[PDB]
Amino acid sequence: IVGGTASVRGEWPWQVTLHTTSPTQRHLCGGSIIGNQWILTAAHCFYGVESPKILRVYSGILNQSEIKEDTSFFGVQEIIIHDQYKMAESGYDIALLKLETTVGYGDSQRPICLPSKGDRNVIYTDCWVTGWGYRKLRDKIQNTLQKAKIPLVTNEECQKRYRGHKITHKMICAGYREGGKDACKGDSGGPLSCKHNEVWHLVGITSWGEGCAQRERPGVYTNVVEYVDWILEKTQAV
Numbered sequence: 001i002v003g004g005t006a007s008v009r010g011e012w013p014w015q016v017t018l019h020t021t022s023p024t025q026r027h028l029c030g031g032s033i034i035g036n037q038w039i040l041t042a043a044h045c046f047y048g049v050e051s052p053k054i055l056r057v058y059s060g061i062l063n064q065s066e067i068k069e070d071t072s073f074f075g076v077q078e079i080i081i082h083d084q085y086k087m088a089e090s091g092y093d094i095a096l097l098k099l100e101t102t103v104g105y106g107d108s109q110r111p112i113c114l115p116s117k118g119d120r121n122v123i124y125t126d127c128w129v130t131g132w133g134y135r136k137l138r139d140k141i142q143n144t145l146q147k148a149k150i151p152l153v154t155n156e157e158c159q160k161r162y163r164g165h166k167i168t169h170k171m172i173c174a175g176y177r178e179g180g181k182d183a184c185k186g187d188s189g190g191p192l193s194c195k196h197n198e199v200w201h202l203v204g205i206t207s208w209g210e211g212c213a214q215r216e217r218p219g220v221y222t223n224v225v226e227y228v229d230w231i232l233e234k235t236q237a238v
């Protein structure tokens with residue numbers, strides 16, 4: 001996160017750190033708890049990931065230094081990638097991780113609500129992007145979970161900023177016209193969480209952008225409201 005501040009423990013209890021054990025143990029992507037055995041994340045995170053066996057999900061983490069070999073985690077049973085996904089820049093940048101065991105909800109880990117399909121006509125004014133990603137394009141993975149308040153940008157305005165790309169209504173952008181606050185490397189897959197009527201909603205999934213926090217280059221997120229049916233299809237299968 002560029003231009004963010006340290007989060008407080010328990011602030012974003014739906015936020016997870018997805019780690020990989022191949023070739024070495026490292027943070028791979030962010031993710032969000034959406035159900036007791038479900039993590040919502042980005043499809044681009046699994047480029048070259050051949051098996052769910054190399055993945056570990058850690059919930060209730062403020063600091064990456066909390067993670068050692070004796071730290072509890074959730075194994076991944078299945079990786080479900082949207083079948084229309086080709087690349088982040090083209091959309092459908094969404095995936096579900098079915099966990100091998102259920103998450104016990106508490107004050108350190110709980111699910112974030114998905115946006116209500118009836119509320120596609122609501123204006124979100126209190127949106128935050130969170131993650132352990134870089135503070136600048138040439139940086140490193142942060143120990144403490146960072147947060148940044150970012151204003152949502154219209155599809156029309158975001159399309160003006162990305163000449164040569166096709167910003168679809170399945171994408172949602174956020175950023176200041178002058179830049180300064182954004183997601184960066186390591187933040188992808190994480191949430192863009194918006195508080196409306198005292199309830200937090202998973203409005204976006206960190207996906208792509210031209211550099212980090214550049215002037216007139218908003219961050220591009222998967223517009224979660226447009227995938228509610230797909231999430232229900234996959235999580236509520238008979």
Ligand SMILES: O=C(N[C@@H](Cc1ccccc1)C(=O)NCCc1cc(Cl)ccc1-n1cnnn1)c1ccc2[nH]c(=O)cc(O)c2c1
Nearest residue numbers: 026027028045183184185186187188207208209211219220
């Ligand atoms: O590049 C990374 N992540 C990419 C995506 C990815 C995922 C998995 C493997 C490879 C690449 C990312 O977050 N990409 C974020 C995309 C992005 C989103 C938005 Cl909304 C705005 C601006 C941007 N950026 C544009 N350029 N940088 N960020 C990434 C992930 C985990 C890492 N762990 C480490 O220990 C060391 C790393 O250097 C490291 C880097």
